[PDB]
Ligand binder design. Structure first.
Ligand SMILES: O=c1[nH]c(NC[C@H](O)[C@H](O)[C@H](O)CO)c([N+](=O)[O-])c(=O)[nH]1
Ligand SMILES: O=c1[nH]c(NC[C@H](O)[C@H](O)[C@H](O)CO)c([N+](=O)[O-])c(=O)[nH]1
Ligand SMILES: O=c1[nH]c(NC[C@H](O)[C@H](O)[C@H](O)CO)c([N+](=O)[O-])c(=O)[nH]1
Ligand SMILES: O=c1[nH]c(NC[C@H](O)[C@H](O)[C@H](O)CO)c([N+](=O)[O-])c(=O)[nH]1
Ligand SMILES: O=c1[nH]c(NC[C@H](O)[C@H](O)[C@H](O)CO)c([N+](=O)[O-])c(=O)[nH]1
Ligand SMILES: [Ca+2]
Ligand SMILES: [Ca+2]
Ligand SMILES: [Ca+2]
Ligand SMILES: [Ca+2]
Ligand SMILES: [Ca+2]
Ligand SMILES: [Ca+2]
Lengths: 147, 146, 146, 146, 146
């Protein structure tokens, strides 16, 4: 009866990933929701992964009520940092719309590691918790609208 | 009488109130009805409209149009620019792909000051503008017989 | 003679008049006829063309092409490059997905000065260029027998 | 022998000539045949390829590949970035979604000086590079038996 | 034993070799096999994977995953961000729409220096990272039973 979420975490920056995951798990536990955690190398493969889960579900696999995308992108000198954020979020958005699924976006895109922590920590901006809660809210709306 | 779904990303509460106030006032004056659904951020507004559409296709409330409200204030983190681009990008695709009337009231400003200049109905009234746009689009949807 | 639908985003009233004047001159000059539909902003131009396409598939007016007109001036707020990007993005995709003739006259400028330099038929004439591009695309569409 | 469609966005005539010369040369050298269709700007190149594909699916000329030729020179207007992004973005989706071989010779430069360095066959020969890329992709299209 | 398709955009030959060496080393170390196909630039990598997918649906080599390798160095021209943007964008959509395992080794850097810091297996080894990312995705694709 409790929603079962799939947390797809891009573990590029491990310590930041743990902050986000701790934020997300905290919010889900707190809400009485259960979850599975899957780790991917970077934000770029987060959408594909949710896609794998959806197709998996259609093949009798675990059926997730929603998803929590966790990740961190720190703009350094390279332009690929803009690309990771943009493409991962872009694909997630399209995904949430095209598949009409509940997705909490916890993909952090900051200038430096200092703000990354400010957003990743549950003690701070708690983006991971905000994302997990966002997924729940969307799970509720998805249910309300009878999508 | 058109019945709209107002989807507000209530990130900044005060601003959200201003925008919603603008949207509601504009629709009231046009004699249009509406429901208000709340989401945490602009990023979930498009999926929300999607939910509404699927629900409608499942016998649920059928909406004539949508008013998306939200506010994104660019501070320091590169995270603000993405919220604006995606939400509005997704809304644009959605309006086209689904051929629906969408008033885009997702405010993307530099700082809180201009946010209020745009959010307040006494000012630029972005919320009202978006609501009116939805009505205009609802009318065009009907004129072309879409 | 080709019959085009001119979809103008009337945000800046005077600049819209300039683009519209430019678009009409080019079409009148070419002998093409047209209807003009007005929307509040560039963001609703793609959906409007979408409405017209579905309207036509429902026995409504069949347009040979489209001329999208609009102007976005990048001021101080971040709510400008998004309008042009998304409006143009959806227009391009629409032209490919639906294989239709679309003249893109959505003007994206840094300031009011270039807006006028591009919007005036007497100058850059962005509207006429878009109108002419639409006609060109109508001819190519027929030439390829698409 | 592969037969390709060169779609040239002829906005800057001289540069267009340089790019076209480069593309034709590369195609001639490879013993490939080609048709040339001209469009006003890079923005209509993707729809044009789309017209040709639908045309082909209606018994029209069947092309083995495409060579998109164009030039965008970034100056002041933000519309220059849009043309570059949109045309190239649509071409890419088109190459993927339709599984066709496309050589991208849409030159996006800062100034005219570098435009010539890239456009001239004697120089960087962007046109020939795009023509050669199209050929390469045609061969690959066949190697995979897609 | 997974069989991957390495699609390398060989624009800067030496850097391409660094990335390929990094990709093969990672795949050989995992016991995975692979075929290597060369394209002229990052813009054709997505269409190439598309070719491989179709070819597979026509009884061609069935790949368990893909490793996209390439390098884009941002200079003065704006044609650099577009190559990285579109290629990566196309790859991302492809991986989602086709539910395929794709390791993105398309290196987007500002200068030759970071290009070398990332392409060398001895250093950041983006080629190996992409290859390993592809393997991880292959494993996940199977764990989820997609
Ligand atoms: O999640 C992230 N992934 C990153 N890797 C890119 C991509 O997400 C994939 O892991 C890999 O490129 C191949 O799929 C990042 N950077 O490279 O900087 C980053 O900041 N964040
Ligand atoms: O509506 C907004 N949402 C924001 N959050 C992003 C997103 O809309 C979602 O709430 C959440 O990311 C997970 O879905 C914002 N910022 O982060 O700055 C903002 O300014 N405005
Ligand atoms: O056509 C324009 N519409 C604008 N409005 C945005 C949008 O096009 C819609 O009118 C409205 O947002 C709700 O749909 C603009 N700005 O806001 O700056 C602009 O410059 N040009
Ligand atoms: O090919 C180009 N077309 C341009 N026109 C834009 C577009 O390609 C179409 O021609 C027209 O806008 C209507 O579709 C350009 N600029 O405006 O600068 C440019 O630099 N290059
Ligand atoms: O892989 C790359 N291809 C490049 N060429 C662009 C494109 O990838 C194709 O090779 C060609 O344009 C025709 O499709 C690059 N630049 O132009 O700079 C680059 O840096 N990297
Ligand atoms: Ca750790
Ligand atoms: Ca009809
Ligand atoms: Ca001046
Ligand atoms: Ca045929
Ligand atoms: Ca097969
Ligand atoms: Ca250095």
């Amino acid at each position: 009866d409790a929603p079962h979420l799939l947390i797809v975490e891009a573990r590029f920056y491990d310590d930041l990933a743990d902050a986000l995951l701790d934020g997300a798990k905290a919010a889900l536990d707190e809400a009485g929701a259960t979850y599975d955690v899957v780790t991917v190398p970077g934000a770029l493969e987060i959408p594909a992964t949710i896609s794998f889960a959806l197709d998996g579900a259609d093949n009798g696999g675990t059926e997730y009520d929603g998803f929590v995308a966790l990740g961190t992108v720190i703009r350094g000198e390279t332009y690929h940092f803009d690309i990771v954020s943009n493409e991962s979020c872009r694909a997630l958005t399209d995904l949430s719309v095209e598949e009409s699924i509940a997705i909490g976006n916890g993909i952090l895109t900051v200038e430096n590691e200092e703000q990354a922590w400010v957003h990743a920590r549950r003690e701070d901006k708690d983006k991971g918790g905000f994302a997990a809660r966002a997924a729940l809210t969307m799970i509720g709306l998805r249910k309300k609208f009878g999508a």
